[PDB]
């Protein structure tokens, strides 16, 4: 396997960040990539064996360390906003050919933590008009006011995650599009049969995993520290 730590991190400009990759494949070769919309996967640094590393295509701002076969670290000595990205480590064997990727680290580097906000979440109940016309019922979930822009939304029916009938916006939208600083919203739909919605013993929950500050982060404001957290909203089926 290939594992990475941390999986999610929000950092401030000027701080030091270290990303760790550990492999149990006994593979000679390891790689650090970043992934950004429109730019694909770009190689930062790589290593063809313990005690060596070499510069990739975009090494600037990053150092790498390969102390052993199993470990490959990426070091940001002075984190800057353009280092906001998804980073992947990968391993491969001498003579090739598959590269085996880790699960990814999402890093956001901010100027300051004052604009970090968890989402508010609301669930909207199906329309009587939809039900009578289609025999189907769509619930809407709206997550609003969050920053930074990454959440994971999931639907839960009677305590189990569902996928059928689920449709989610591909990307969050900016609530104030004219600003660099804007907070974000995201919507998702769950569609079920009218009869399932009309049963009052069915429980529906929109869950939003938000990624924010950690527990060893300093916080000096008169509002709740916007930690990594789940925010949910829920609705019960309605008999009429």
């Amino acid at each position: 396997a290939v594992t990475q730590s941390p999986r999610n991190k929000v950092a401030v400009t000027g701080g030091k960040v270290t990303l760790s990759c550990d492999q149990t494949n006994n593979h000679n070769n390891m790689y650090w990539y970043r992934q950004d919309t429109g730019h694909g996967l770009r190689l930062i640094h790589y290593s063809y064996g313990a005690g060596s590393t070499e510069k990739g295509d975009i090494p600037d701002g990053y150092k790498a360390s390969r102390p052993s076969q199993k470990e490959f670290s990426l070091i940001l000595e002075l984190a800057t906003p353009s280092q906001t990205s998804v980073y992947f480590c990968a391993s491969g064997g001498l003579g090739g050919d598959e590269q085996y990727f880790g699960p990814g680290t999402r890093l956001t580097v901010l100027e300051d933590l004052k604009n970090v906000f968890p989402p508010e979440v609301a669930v909207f109940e199906p329309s009587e008009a939809e039900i009578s016309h289609t025999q189907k019922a769509t619930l809407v979930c709206l997550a609003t006011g969050f920053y930074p822009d990454h959440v994971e939304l999931s639907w839960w029916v009677n305590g189990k995650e569902v996928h059928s009938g689920v449709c989610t916006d591909p990307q969050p939208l900016k609530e104030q599009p004219a600003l660099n600083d804007s907070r974000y919203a995201l919507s998702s739909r769950l569609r079920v049969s009218a009869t399932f919605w009309q049963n009052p013993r069915n429980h529906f929950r929109c869950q939003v995993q938000f990624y924010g500050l950690s527990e060893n982060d300093e916080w000096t404001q008169d509002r709740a520290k916007p930690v990594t957290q789940i925010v949910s909203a829920e609705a019960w089926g309605r008999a009429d």
Binding site: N29, G38, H39, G40, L41, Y48, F88, A90, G92, L94, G95, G96, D97, E98, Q99, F101, G102, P103, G104, A122, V123, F124, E125, P126, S127, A129, E130, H133, T134, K136, T138, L139, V140, L142, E152, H163, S164, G165, V166, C167, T168, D169, P170, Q171, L173, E175, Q176, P177, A185, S187, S188, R189, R191, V192, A233, E234, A235
Partner: protein, 190 residues
């Protein structure tokens, strides 16, 4: 080595085929893998071809290599939501040396529902908790319908949603609009 991958964005209706085309510069390249990256996950090798081979096929996927023109491609027959992902092609030399793996910039493939008997319609839904906080829902339109987008800093209109790639049933298109003025009717909204 420079690898060109097109299209960058590929929207295809379930049941139709999808094709990604790539080209490379270095005639020494002899190894051409394809990686799939599911939403929120990591790239994973799904299929490859080498310069000794022209065509391979498995599980409804076809990979072609035209070594003379330095072109190669992936074809997914009978697309389904499970195919929605980022795809990357690559070119390498390979075999007791290592050679660079050079990736294309990626293709974001989104598979859309096949709506046989569309019945486009707009609905108003109320918050489960509060008042008349409200949203408008546009639904039951076919996947070739485009959704207009706002025009005013007080009305929010989402793009159309993308199916959960594990969805097996109840696949429909929708978009949502909401305001906070209201002062705003749903008949107008889209």
């Amino acid at each position: 080595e420079q690898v060109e991958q097109l299209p960058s964005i590929l929207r295809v209706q379930e049941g139709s085929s999808a094709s990604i085309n790539c080209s490379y510069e270095d005639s020494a390249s002899n190894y051409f893998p394809w990686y799939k990256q599911e939403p929120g996950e990591n790239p994973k090798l799904i299929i490859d071809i080498r310069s000794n081979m022209e065509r391979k096929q498995t599980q409804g996927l076809i990979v072609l290599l035209d070594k003379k023109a330095k072109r190669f491609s992936l074809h997914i027959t009978d697309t389904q939501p499970g195919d929605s992902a980022m795809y990357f092609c690559a070119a390498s030399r390979r075999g007791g040396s290592n050679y660079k793996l050079t990736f294309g910039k990626g293709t974001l493939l989104t598979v859309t529902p096949n709506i046989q008997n569309p019945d486009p319609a707009v609905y108003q839904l109320r918050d489960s908790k509060s008042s008349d906080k409200s949203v408008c829902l546009f639904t039951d339109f076919d996947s070739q319908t485009n959704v207009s987008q706002s025009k005013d800093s007080d009305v929010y209109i989402t793009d159309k949603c993308v199916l959960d790639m594990r969805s097996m049933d109840f696949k429909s298109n929708s978009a949502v609009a909401w305001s906070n003025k209201s002062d705003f009717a749903c008949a107008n909204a889209f």
